Paper text:
One such protein is [name] (SulE), a ruberythrin-like protein isolated from the thermophilic archeon Sulfolobus tokodaii. SulE lacks the characteristic C-terminal, rubredoxin-like FeS4 domain of ruberythrins and contains a binuclear metal centre that coordinates iron and zinc when isolated from [name]. In contrast to other members of the ruberythrin family, a crystal structure of native SulE shows that it forms homodimers through domain swapping, with each monomer contributing two α-helices to give two four-helix bundles that each harbour a solvent-accessible, single dimetal site. The exact function of SulE is unknown, but it is presumed to be involved in reactions against oxidative stress.
Author numbering:
A (entry chain B): 0 to 142
B (entry chain A): 0 to 143
Amino acid sequence: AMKDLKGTKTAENLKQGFIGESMANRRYLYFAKRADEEGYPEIAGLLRSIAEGETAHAFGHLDFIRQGGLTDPATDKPIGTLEQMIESAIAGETYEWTQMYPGFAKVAREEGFPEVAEWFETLARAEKSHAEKFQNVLKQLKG
Amino acid sequence: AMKDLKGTKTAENLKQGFIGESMANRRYLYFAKRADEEGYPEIAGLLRSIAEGETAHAFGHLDFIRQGGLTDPATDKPIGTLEQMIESAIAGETYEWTQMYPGFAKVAREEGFPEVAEWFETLARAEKSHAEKFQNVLKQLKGG
Ligand SMILES: [Cl-]
Ligand SMILES: [Cl-]
Ligand SMILES: [Fe+3]
Ligand SMILES: [Fe+3]
Ligand SMILES: [Fe+3]
Ligand SMILES: [Fe+3]
Ligand SMILES: [O-]
Ligand SMILES: [O-]
């Protein structure tokens, strides 16, 4: 591996860089769909290509995070081995279905946004399904 | 009014949901590559399929954000129209190349991590290129 990054500002900067690059890929693919609808195929293709750049950037941030002994930006769990990667996926999905999306749904209903609440409730059930499927993966890797 | 979400906690939750879903898709595609190398194609395929779920979630969050008159989670700029979307991309990439990545690179060098610094410098130049390409897009939308 590489030099230990724990405790540095660079460790936090890699995390923040990963967050921004992740958002950018999602944003640019969403924007490309609007270009698609409106008939701007060269713009849409450029947006998709820039999005591939942001993928490369996000993955490179993860490379340095993993090689520097740091944890997953999303879950604060190690992601050195495949088993650890799956354990990180389980931890994040579990946070999302047990805490995050149910709370978002409750708040949306309290604030008078039942349609948004229904979306958050759909997502809560979806993340529970994801968590169960990843748990099945881990069981198979450890057997 | 679901069409005016400004200032509500639900607005903040949509933003945070978008951030988490965006990271999840990137993480699961990265993890899939390790499964690929090691010969676990069913695990890799599951990671890729779940990642498509996280794409749908992120895009749905953006749908509610736009429909509610809220701004881009990354830039705090409106993203209703295509021109606005491109203007948001320009603002974010400009921040990344003029401030964010150069600052990250300086810190990495000062902390004794030259390989990470070089990566941040490569990314700074890349985001400058991205900003210029988005600027060209805006020129084309405006008539160029
Ligand atoms: Cl075009
Ligand atoms: Cl497999
Ligand atoms: Fe980037
Ligand atoms: Fe999830
Ligand atoms: Fe999700
Ligand atoms: Fe960028
Ligand atoms: O980026
Ligand atoms: O998720």
